[PDB]
Amino acid sequence: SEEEQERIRRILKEARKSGTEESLRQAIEDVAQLAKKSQDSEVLEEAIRVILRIAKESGSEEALRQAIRAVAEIAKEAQDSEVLEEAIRVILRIAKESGSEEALRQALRAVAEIAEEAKDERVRKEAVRVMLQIAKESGSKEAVKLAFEMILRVVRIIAVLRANSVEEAKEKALAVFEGGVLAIEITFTVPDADTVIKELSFLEKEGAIIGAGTVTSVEQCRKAVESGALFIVSPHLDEEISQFCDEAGVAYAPGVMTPTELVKAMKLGHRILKLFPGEVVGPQFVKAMKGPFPNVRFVPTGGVNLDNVAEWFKAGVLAVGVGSALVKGTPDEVREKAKAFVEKIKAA
Amino acid sequence: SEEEQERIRRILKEARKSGTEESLRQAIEDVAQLAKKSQDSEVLEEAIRVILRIAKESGSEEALRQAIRAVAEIAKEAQDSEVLEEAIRVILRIAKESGSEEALRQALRAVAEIAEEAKDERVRKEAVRVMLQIAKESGSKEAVKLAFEMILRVVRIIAVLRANSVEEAKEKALAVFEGGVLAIEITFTVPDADTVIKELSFLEKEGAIIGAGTVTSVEQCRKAVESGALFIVSPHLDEEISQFCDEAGVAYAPGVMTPTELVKAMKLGHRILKLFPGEVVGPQFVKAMKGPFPNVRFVPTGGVNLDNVAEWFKAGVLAVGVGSALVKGTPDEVREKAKAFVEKIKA
Amino acid sequence: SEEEQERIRRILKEARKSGTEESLRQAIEDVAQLAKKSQDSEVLEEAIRVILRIAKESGSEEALRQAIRAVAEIAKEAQDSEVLEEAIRVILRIAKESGSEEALRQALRAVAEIAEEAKDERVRKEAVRVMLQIAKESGSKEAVKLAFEMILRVVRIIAVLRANSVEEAKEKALAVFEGGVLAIEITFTVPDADTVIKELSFLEKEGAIIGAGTVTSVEQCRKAVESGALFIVSPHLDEEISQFCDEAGVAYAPGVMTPTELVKAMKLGHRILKLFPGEVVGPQFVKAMKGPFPNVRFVPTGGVNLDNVAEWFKAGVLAVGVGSALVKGTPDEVREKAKAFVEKIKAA
């Protein structure tokens, strides 16, 4: 393997000596070509970190975007999760260098695709934290919705927590974390809900996402975004709120229940919707919405349980919002329920 | 105990000779104190008469509204229903002399709370009759809404009546009233429904409340009122009907089906909503709305049947609207199904 | 027999010698009297030629409309389909001679009623073909709505086509037409639905009716009606589409799901509504709507299948919109399942 290792170095030294820009992007495809013929974990990591310096020296977005597709292909060919974690951190470095958001959208879809074919949770925890930073590093009008859509596509399950004692609530939030589902949503009905989402903001740095729900007024939503909420679930579409999330750069997934309410939600720029109550319309609703409204996905949060969640995802839902069937009870028991829901989603 | 009648008459005569309003408000507290130590039905009902005698002599709003709480507390401590019937009639007379919306609102919640703990059909009939008269006074928007809300809490079940003639509707409404159903909704599918609600006005004197359902227009609602209806029930949310019902002083329960329609109904000022069709959304909808909308209560009028009616009230529902499953058949059949629904609602 | 045929010749010759319109009006009821007493496919279909033949006194919406009820009565008592076909064509010529709005609307209900006694389907295809020409003679807003209601009253089932090419959409449309489904809705998920509607416009002269579905904008709706669409279908209620469909003389069935959406559609002048998704609310919804809204008809286009369509019509639905369960598969499969849907509706 030391022979091809030197070969990757020889391509580098000769590509730098070649002042032509075509040989620079050609060196990207040359390194990717030999990485496709390899089967070792360490070889793919050296190849990926090599493509970084080539495109950054080119200074053109055509080489940066071509590098994102190369590292994403090497990560799909690999088998060690160590290379996948470095691939995600590398894609962040490429997209951050361009910063033109044409690559940021492509980087998010690549990061979420790498986390999709992941055997352990460490890769998915790396992804969610990076996609948050990618949307944060972007800091613009879009990307937050694409991050929200992709992160939900990775975490698959979002919990609905409610407890009067913040001591008991955080005992459940960490507990549902321990199951590995991540992406916990806390209800705003809880009296000291501002504090629970601020003290649980340390989960954001470990691969989780915290948000507020049942938000009905702009004043209540302002309190959530100041406390650390990254998404506002809501019970029904609100015109005043939806304009505040777009100005504040926070994702907003309003609640709909009929196709007519769906169209009014799309008229305000919301293709990520909340199906509420989900148990009322059932999975037949999301199946019937695919035809007339493609590329539009929902997150049903109603009477979803272990018997329901199996047939919600076969209908093509983005994520599912479970509440009493997951969080209610002692913390150690909802850790086993959080593991049970993840196991049920991965199968059907 | 005859000694308590003396002591009660001593507290009145002593505080009457004083005349100071400080001692008069203390006389209500002294009479209410001895009433809590006694278990005689005649000692308690005499204390209620004296509490009224003291308050109406004081004349102040503070003393009159304190007398309402005292009479209401004596009712909660009593077992004889004749004490509760007397308390309701006294609560009416105290708020009637006082006036203002605060006393009349406090009286509406008091006589309705007494009706729940009464566990007797006679007291619930009197509560409806008094609450209608309390709402007839003042006549404010908040009075007719609160009175309609408390009345639905007491009767628990409203009958959606449909027939093929005025006489068949009159006999069905009387039959369902004998079963224990005190609230009757007359749809406009019955021919001459305005004549049916007009000739059924004698039931409102025996503890009933007749209204009009299936109201689609304002011309339809204008004929429902003036003909004697006390509440208007529509399958959807109408902006003009809610306007006409507000300025006419009549309760209005519109129909909703989705949380988006719920919020729009609250924006108009209605927190007592008709869930229609209730059989489509099911009790899962009512439990789901309790979270973000706690101060909103529903009345499902869909496929409410003896099987699911138990599950509806287990979901925190104000009242249920039944039809066909209740009002279909002979008057004898309606009377027995009326007794069956009231029995299963008691749970 | 022909002893009655000679009598009909005498009724016409003698009443024509009189010339008084009261005797020509009596000649119609005399012919319809002896036609009621006879059972002969040749005596009946000749009696209605004479009733049409007695147009010497122009009804001007008096004698002509008396002729329509007489020929519609002869067709009701008949059994031979050749008499029913001749009755429909004669009613068209009588209403075309009058030109009044009452005669044209009375002819629509007469022709549609003749097709309800079905058996041979060429009558139903001729009825739809004739009812379209009647609506184009009137051209009023009431005529387009009534003709659309009557055609759906006859065809009972609408095919909701979704394809991935113009050629597969054309082939499936021909396949569902040969199966017995005379109503075809071309969704805009098809790449070039306008050309599909345009190339399928020849079926409208054979007894079919081509329309567009899943329309969201007025630009979409204008291209559909300019391509040959005779009815516009949307998943929700669009105020601007209803405005354009009115001034363009094209039927429009909006989508409703709650009773409040029902009322908002009626106040715009729509009593033929699309219940969507029908599988979510179920036939319990349409049964409960007939109480407050007896004039509304509904066409459920949800999860309609062979097990569903039986209990949809028992609840009194006008027509049903079937897709996937009818359109998906090879063109050879969708022919035989179209025959099964038509056969299942005929029974229950």
Numbering used by the authors:
A (entry chain B), C (entry chain C): 1 to 348
B (entry chain A): 1 to 347
Give the published text.
We develop a hierarchical approach to designing multi-component protein assemblies from two classes of modular building blocks: designed helical repeat proteins (DHRs) and helical bundle oligomers (HBs). We first rigidly fuse DHRs to HBs to generate a large library of oligomeric building blocks. We then generate assemblies with cyclic, dihedral, and point group symmetries from these building blocks using architecture guided rigid helical fusion with new software named WORMS. X-ray crystallography and cryo-electron microscopy characterization show that the hierarchical design approach can accurately generate a wide range of assemblies, including a 43 nm diameter icosahedral nanocage.
The second protocol simplifies the process by overlapping the helical termini of the DHRs and HBs and designing only the immediate residues around the junction (HelixFuse, HF). For the second approach, HelixFuse (HF), the same set of DHRs and HBs were combinatorially fused together by overlapping the terminal helix residues in both directions (“AB”: c-terminus of HB to n-terminus of DHR, “BA”: n-terminus of HB to c-terminus of DHR). We were able to solve the X-ray crystal structure of C3_nat_HF-0005 to 3.32 Å resolution. We show that it is possible to genetically fuse DHR “adapters” to natural proteins; these proteins can then be used in larger assemblies through WORMS with less likelihood of disrupting the original protein fold.
